[PDB]
Design a protein around this nucleic acid. Structure first.
Lengths: 46, 46, 147, 212
RNA sequence: CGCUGGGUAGCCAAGUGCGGAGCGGAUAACUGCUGAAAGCAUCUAAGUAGUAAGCCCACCCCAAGAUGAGUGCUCUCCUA
RNA sequence: UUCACAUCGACGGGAAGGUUUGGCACCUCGAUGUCGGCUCUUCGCCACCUGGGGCUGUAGUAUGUUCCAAGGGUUGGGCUGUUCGCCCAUUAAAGCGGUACGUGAGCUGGGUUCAGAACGUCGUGAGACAGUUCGGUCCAUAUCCGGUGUGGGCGUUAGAG
RNA sequence: UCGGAGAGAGGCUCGGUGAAAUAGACAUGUCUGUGAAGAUGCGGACUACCUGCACCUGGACAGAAAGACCCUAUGAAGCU
RNA sequence: CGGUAGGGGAGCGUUCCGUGUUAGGGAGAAACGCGUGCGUGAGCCGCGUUGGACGAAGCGGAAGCGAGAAUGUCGGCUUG
RNA sequence: GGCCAGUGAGACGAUGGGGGAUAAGCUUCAUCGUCGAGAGGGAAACAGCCCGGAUCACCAGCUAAGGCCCCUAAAUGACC
RNA sequence: AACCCAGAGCUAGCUGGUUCUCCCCGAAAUGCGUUGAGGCGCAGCAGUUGACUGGACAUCUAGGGGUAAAGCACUGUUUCG
RNA sequence: AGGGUGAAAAGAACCCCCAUCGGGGAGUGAAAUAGAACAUGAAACCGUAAGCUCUCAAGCAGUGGGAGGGGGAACC
């Protein structure tokens, strides 16, 4: 004994998924080419 | 010693069916006794 | 519109074969149970059994890395106390070999009503010949560089 | 597996055989209603193991079904009520056709182990099936002879299986081992086998040398 | 069943019979054998020997509802 | 005897356990029935005895200690309501524990927490003492899970022995 | 010690009459883990054909009485 | 534009009264159901039956006015 | 200011501390977060940790926390 | 310290119960006093309504404090010569 | 605590099963599956028949997806 144990909430901070590798923390999503705009989608003109 | 909770209709129908059916098996015996008691050689029923 | 739903498929499922002579246990069992489910089919559907029978042969000579061959233990516990049965992989592979793989995939694939039903799609044999020429089993594709 | 082929006899009471030395020894008495005849032999290739199927108690054809009489007939033997095979170390040299055997053999193998359906004692209680004990019969006590406790409190949460409840006691066959043969009489074809062997006189009684 | 003596079968025991085995395979502690890493040594890293009431098979009893539902030698009828 | 480590290990330090005495008081006061025995378990070990081994300040016979070992075993009594609290006679030894200090819808009620009564003491007094002393009806025809036995249908793809 | 056999009445099966307390609905597994920190109802793994009858009582914090011990109420009552 | 205690706004419905011995109604008033007809919803329109007598809508008024929780309570029924 | 409420023992986490034994899912205060009153995904299950804030429909897409062998989505992808 | 009837539907700061729809806003569990602390009064934080308003958020600059850290001038202890 | 056949008992002649309990015809009545433990008749609960379906199962038992089949020929 002489060592406490880690309970609810307390247990969570020790043992939740952390992304502890500086690299993957850094990253950002792909961007893209700007994708020039798109036409209308509907027309009464018929 | 005291039941917790009433049984369903499901279960009860099962057991009542086993009761009655237990009566089913004990007719065809009486029907054999009949179909044999229709006049014939036999040593029973003076 | 509406996604297609696996509509009745009975037999003529592909039979495959894997000679497990020195093919490490886990990785092989992942690529067995991925052809047991049907995740190699645009017809994939979790709720229906679109899978495909397979046949492991030489089930005595599956390899395992490290010191496993004396460490890994398969334990079957009787329901009563004291029933725990320590059992090392060497004793099984000596004694009843097909149960080895019969565990590996049986953990890989999704237990339930359906998983239980499919597990029959694995036929395991300790000899070197398999008695099935059912669909003339075409050898099984392995996409795993490490086996 | 067993060491050698055996025979099957019938329990016929007991008695004492005064050994000429003047020592008293109990014996039972084994008898054959009809002689043991081989009626099959199965190989490791045609079938999964090796064994010889002997039969006992010849009976009228009526008493016995068509599948039976066909099985008996194919091997060209007489009818026979009881029918069992000794699985034998795969060394069989037997023609399955009526190799009527005998006790030319057990007098040499002077230790025999027999298999007998014991007698049956219905639905016996705890105090007698499993040799329990019983609470005090006096001192205000109120639970004699009852099975007493069952398990622990909340944790085991149920009764460990294989608990020693009451139930049916006899009726299943049992061995008895290294039981020694003793002076036999071939004119009466009776065995005077020391010891006490399962069953009230008149049940079938397998009989085969030891497996030491 | 008045209370007592005696008792076959049955069931019992304080009676009687028998039983825990050539067992064989891996092991734990331990003792080793050859032997470098480390031009000595070290039971170990390669490989092997011995060895515990402990483990597994053997022993004895169930057992294919083992839905993975086994096996085979006989039967049973194809007239609608 | 010399010799720190055969054996004991002062002075101080670092841990695991969870069963003693405790700290909190989180569930349970439309209720989770207490001590000790009886019967029946089953599990843990850091091992008391039996199996194998080192080391010994082991000649042998005894040992002393540690190491793997839970398969088994782990008496009968006298005293007390009172698990190493204990003398007697053995015995291979006569272990420590967990299981709601296992087990009261299984048992007794010797103790304690009921009403009577008394002793010492406190209280002027009614009364009181985790002091003592004698007496004091512990209820139950299992619904379900559990377990021991035993069946039937049905599956086993023709049907059966 | 150390149980055993027996007779009677129940139990058991069949014919007749026929209650009870309890009861949210229950299609009501084991081990571990979790969780108002001792779950069939959640998670993972194992295990288990459906359903009877007899038998035992470890659980369903089982039934019984809105605890009788402990505390509170500017509660009630008795005695001094 | 989450929301318990809680506050405010807008509504439906039920028995009865004013408009009435109303419209309608023995070719047939209400309880049961087909219409995902209709509504954000409480509910409303239609639709049918052996029986079968009353009674809407609209604009208003009043309330013994809306229930699965009180170990509630009266009756009928089960479980065991 | 008016008309009117409910609340009055919170819990844990981070920090600075008292008490405790720099023990408690302990207790007591100060400053913040979540739960209370809040869903959803990660955390196996799991108020109080992380992202995040639920008006509804969509058998459309991009991401955060977390992840890419199988059970479950996604590289058993690159090189050190 | 009877039982029935009456005051009596006694009292209960205590337990349980409090029924039909939608919409908007939506807390506290703190201090103080209390024969008071598993109540109540006031404040503190909701609603809704009427005025007068000015901000809130970010930035920067001033002003006092003696905390963290440091120090041995002070006070109290503190080792070696 | 126990109310409500019908407008009028016209309350059931006769027949058959028949211990005269209770029924099926016949008859009355507009209707008696209104017939006397009779007026509408809900729910719980007890059955019956038809449609599809459960015996390697795991579940506060529903829900989103829907295999297979039955219904009048896209909806249940």
């Amino acid at each position: 004994s002489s060592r406490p144990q880690k309970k609810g909430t307390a247990h969570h901070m020790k043992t939740r998924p952390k992304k502890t590798a500086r690299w993957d923390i850094k990253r950002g999503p792909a961007v893209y080419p700007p994708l020039p705009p798109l036409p209308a989608e509907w027309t009464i003109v018929s | 010693a005291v039941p917790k909770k009433r049984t369903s209709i499901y279960k009860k129908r099962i057991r009542k069916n086993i009761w009655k059916k237990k009566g089913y098996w004990a007719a065809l015996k009486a029907f054999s006794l009949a179909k044999s008691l229709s006049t014939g050689n036999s040593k029973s029923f003076f | 519109w509406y996604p297609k739903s696996a509509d009745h498929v009975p037999t003529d499922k592909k039979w495959y074969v894997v000679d497990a002579t020195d093919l490490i246990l886990g990785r092989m069992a992942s690529t067995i149970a991925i052809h047991i489910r049907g995740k190699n089919l645009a017809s994939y559907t979790p709720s229906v059994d679109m899978g495909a029978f397979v046949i492991v042969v030489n089930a005595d000579k599956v390899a395992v890395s490290g010191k496993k061959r004396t460490q890994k233990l398969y334990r079957r516990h009787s329901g009563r106390p004291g029933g725990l049965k320590e059992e090392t992989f060497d004793q099984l592979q000596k004694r009843i070999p097909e149960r080895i793989i019969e565990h590996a995939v049986r953990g890989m694939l999704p237990k339930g009503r359906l998983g239980r039903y499919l597990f029959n799609h694995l036929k395991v044999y300790k000899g070197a010949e398999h008695p099935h020429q059912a669909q003339q089993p075409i050898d099984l594709p392995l996409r795993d560089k490490r086996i | 597996v067993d060491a050698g082929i055996g025979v099957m006899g019938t329990k016929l009471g007991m008695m004492s055989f005064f050994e000429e030395d003047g020592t008293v020894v109990p014996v039972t008495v084994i008898g054959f209603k009809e002689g043991n005849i081989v009626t099959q032999v199965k190989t490791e290739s045609t079938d999964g193991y090796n064994a010889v199927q002997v039969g006992y108690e010849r009976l009228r054809d009526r008493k016995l079904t068509m599948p039976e009489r066909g099985h008996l007939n194919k091997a060209g033997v007489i009818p026979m009520r009881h029918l069992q095979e000794f699985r034998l170390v795969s060394v069989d040299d037997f023609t399955p056709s009526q190799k009527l055997l005998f006790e030319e053999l057990f007098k040499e193998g002077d230790m025999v182990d027999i298999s007998g359906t014991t007698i049956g004692k219905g639905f016996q209680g705890g105090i007698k099936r499993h040799n329990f004990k019983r609470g005090l019969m006096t001192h205000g006590s109120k639970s004699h002879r009852a099975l007493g406790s069952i398990g622990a409190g909340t944790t085991p949460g149920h009764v460990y299986k294989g608990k020693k409840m009451p139930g049916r006691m006899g009726g299943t066959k049992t061995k008895i081992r290294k039981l020694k043969i003793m002076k036999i009489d071939t004119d009466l074809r009776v065995v005077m086998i020391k010891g006490a062997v399962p069953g009230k006189p008149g049940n079938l009684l397998r009989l085969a040398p030891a497996k030491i």
